[PDB]
Ligand binder design. Structure first.
Ligand SMILES: CN(C(=O)[C@H](Cc1cnc[nH]1)NC(=O)OCc1ccccc1)[C@@H](Cc1ccccc1)C(=O)N[C@@H](Cc1ccc(O)cc1)C(=O)NO
Ligand SMILES: [Ca+2]
Ligand SMILES: [Zn+2]
Lengths: 308, 324
């Protein structure tokens, strides 16, 4: 194994050396594409070599036929996909694909969306691939509603959902674009997320998203009968989960946040009790929880002082 | 749930002498040659950690200054190494190095400013280089470079702010571009950016602070986003961001200190990403810098914004006000 590393080094170094020499010479040709393909396969974070490929492809575009240039582009797509299979988390490789697709006369965006779906099957948290999917969605003018359906299938079929919930948080406002979601939409989202965290109470992503939904409302004194009833129902359901999972800190925090959403002063006693339980359960966050409790006690004093 | 379990014979003491020896001897090898594409940053990591340990004199100043001059291109940008292409990442690293050495005029400062200025886009974002990759990493590189040169006024600051704020997410964090998911690395870049441009009042410190402190796992280590393994460097991005927004006390400082110390290699010196792994200069800097932010006596105070000794930033009078 050791001897072969010295074998790879010298080949890597000699190829690298050869590419640089060719570049100063102004030899923007296929020999460079050959040499870089060897190096970029093992080492896709070597950015200057991606720059070299672009300079060669740009130069060849001028002194080749449409059919020859089309062939070069198809070869490039294949090279990129092979590089991505080996290292799907390289900035340079994903950027070169974007650079390439952005300059094509007739890019096949549907094929690119399918590439994204396949890579997201392999790693549902690959942010490079989610970012690329957004790029393709924009370029192909794919509507928020279609992307919303994609996220749904991804959330129910398995876990590793933080990236999918995040995408939803960005897509929902676009379906209802204001210069703070509508209540009907919010209620559906609450139902969807509540299913998520009662299915897997250890999935932190649903709890983080739920905290956002609890803020995306119109106020506690503006609580409709339906939203009031839904939040009270969540509250009792969380207490249920708390008996099943007494070490589950997410459910305890969410109970506190729900009581805040419902009636700060009426639930003051219970809120303080829950802070004591939560700190016992999640000791590393004790400093955070004390600052949150202090903030809530301060809000309560201001609410009490507003009394006529 | 995904976490490491620290074995009970992991290092529990700071081995500063071994770390200085490791960095002093680095690049005296397969990995060195394969990371030539980031050499300028490698040099920055080495010199900064040595200076935080009081050992900068053991490095070769004159050799590094000549290397930096040879990496500035005609456009004013700086490459990672001689013959490589210029990029904002290595322009920042070079300026940080020259700031450590009080040798800024070794390069053409006017041309650096022009290079940085040229990479800003109509929406206020910055590309990393002429090939156009857009990332909030580069917004930070741009303003940190200019701040250190006293030339922040050379860019469109309001538009730059507007772009960075458009990258703020539902959870209080930031991603690389508008719509991108929150990540500790990006949060460090964006909170650092907002510190430099005096816009920390626009961050939701309680919300982001919570997302950040939830990066701490039972092992004591920090991850960079939910459901990832902890790493001594995600540990650093998270701590620096928390310090910038005035919420460093929201993590368990003793448990984190023990995790960072457990990442040391007692035989070779250096820190690894996690206990028992192979060390490298990158994780050595971020392990030592993390320990300094946590208040370790043997290490110089470190800037959470610039990851450079505070005494260096005091000298050039570039000290962004933090939240607290
Ligand atoms: C390019 N890079 C990375 O991709 C590392 C990889 C890694 C770290 N730990 C295990 N592997 N990842 C990384 O730095 O993530 C940080 C980050 C991401 C997005 C934004 C800001 C920081 C690392 C180097 C590395 C390569 C391979 C293995 C370890 C380190 C790197 O150069 N990071 C940059 C991060 C950065 C870049 C730009 C900024 O404005 C601020 C920070 C750095 O620290 N420069 O001084
Ligand atoms: Ca010296
Ligand atoms: Zn790391």
């Amino acid at each position: 194994k050791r001897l072969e590393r010295e074998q790879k080094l010298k080949l890597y170094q000699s190829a690298t050396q050869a590419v640089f020499q060719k570049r100063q010479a102004g030899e923007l040709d296929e020999s460079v594409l050959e040499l870089t393909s060897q190096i970029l396969g093992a080492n896709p974070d070597f950015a200057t070599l991606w720059n070299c490929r672009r300079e060669v492809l740009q130069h060849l575009e001028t002194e080749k036929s449409p059919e020859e240039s089309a062939a070069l582009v198809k070869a490039e797509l294949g090279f990129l996909e092979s590089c991505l299979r080996v290292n799907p988390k390289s900035y340079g490789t994903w950027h070169h694909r974007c650079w390439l697709l952005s300059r094509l006369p007739e890019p096949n965006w549907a094929r690119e969306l399918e590439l994204c779906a396949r890579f997201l099957e392999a790693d549902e948290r690959n942010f490079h691939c989610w970012d690329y999917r957004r790029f393709v969605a924009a370029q192909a003018a794919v509507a928020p509603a279609e992307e919303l359906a994609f996220t749904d299938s991804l959330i129910t079929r398995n876990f590793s959902n933080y990236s999918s919930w995040h995408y939803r948080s960005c897509l929902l406002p676009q379906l209802h674009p204001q210069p703070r979601l509508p209540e009907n939409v919010l209620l559906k989202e609450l139902e969807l997320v509540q299913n998520a965290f009662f299915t897997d109470p250890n999935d932190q992503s649903a709890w983080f998203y739920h905290r956002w939904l609890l803020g995306a409302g119109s106020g506690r004194c503006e609580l409709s009968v339906e939203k009031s009833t839904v939040l009270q129902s969540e509250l009792e359901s969380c207490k249920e989960l708390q008996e099943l999972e007494p070490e589950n800190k997410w459910c305890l925090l969410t109970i506190i946040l729900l009581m805040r959403a419902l009636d700060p002063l009426l639930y003051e006693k219970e809120t303080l009790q829950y802070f004591s339980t939560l700190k016992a359960v999640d000791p590393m966050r004790a400093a955070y929880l004390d600052d949150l409790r202090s903030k809530f006690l301060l809000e309560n004093s201001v609410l009490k002082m507003e009394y006529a | 749930q995904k976490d490491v379990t620290i074995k009970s014979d992991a290092p529990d003491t700071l081995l500063l002498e071994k770390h200085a020896d490791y960095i002093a001897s680095y690049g005296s090898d397969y990995e060195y040659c394969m990371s030539e594409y980031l050499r300028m940053s490698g040099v920055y990591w080495g010199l900064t950690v040595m200076d935080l340990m009081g050992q900068l004199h053991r490095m070769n100043k004159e050799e590094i200054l000549v290397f930096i001059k040879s990496c500035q291109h005609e456009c004013g940008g700086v490459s990672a190494s001689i013959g490589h292409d210029p990029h904002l990442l290595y322009t920042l690293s070079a300026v940080q190095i020259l700031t450590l050495y009080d040798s800024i005029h070794v390069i053409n400062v006017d041309k650096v400013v022009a290079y940085v200025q040229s990479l800003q886009k109509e929406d206020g974002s910055f590309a990393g280089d002429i090939w156009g990759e857009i990332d909030t990493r580069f917004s930070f590189c741009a303003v940190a470079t200019l701040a250190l040169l006293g030339k922040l006024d050379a860019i469109n600051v309001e538009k730059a702010i507007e772009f960075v704020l458009s990258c703020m997410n539902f959870d209080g964090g930031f991603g690389c571009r508008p719509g991108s998911e929150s990540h500790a690395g990006q949060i460090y870049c964006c909170t650092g950016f907002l510190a430099i441009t005096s816009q920390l009042h626009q961050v939701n410190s309680d919300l982001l602070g919570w997302w950040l402190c939830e990066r701490q796992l039972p092992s004591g280590g920090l991850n960079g986003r939910p459901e990832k393994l902890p790493d001594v460097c995600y540990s650093w991005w998270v701590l620096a961001s928390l310090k910038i927004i005035g919420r460093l006390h929201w993590i368990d400082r003793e448990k984190l200190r023990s995790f960072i110390l457990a990442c040391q290699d007692e035989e070779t010196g250096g820190f690894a990403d996690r206990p028992g792994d192979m060390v490298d200069p990158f994780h050595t800097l971020f392990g030592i810098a993390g320990l300094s932010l946590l208040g370790e006596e043997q290490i110089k105070p470190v800037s959470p914004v610039f990851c450079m000794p505070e005494e260096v930033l005091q000298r050039v009078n570039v000290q962004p006000e933090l939240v607290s």
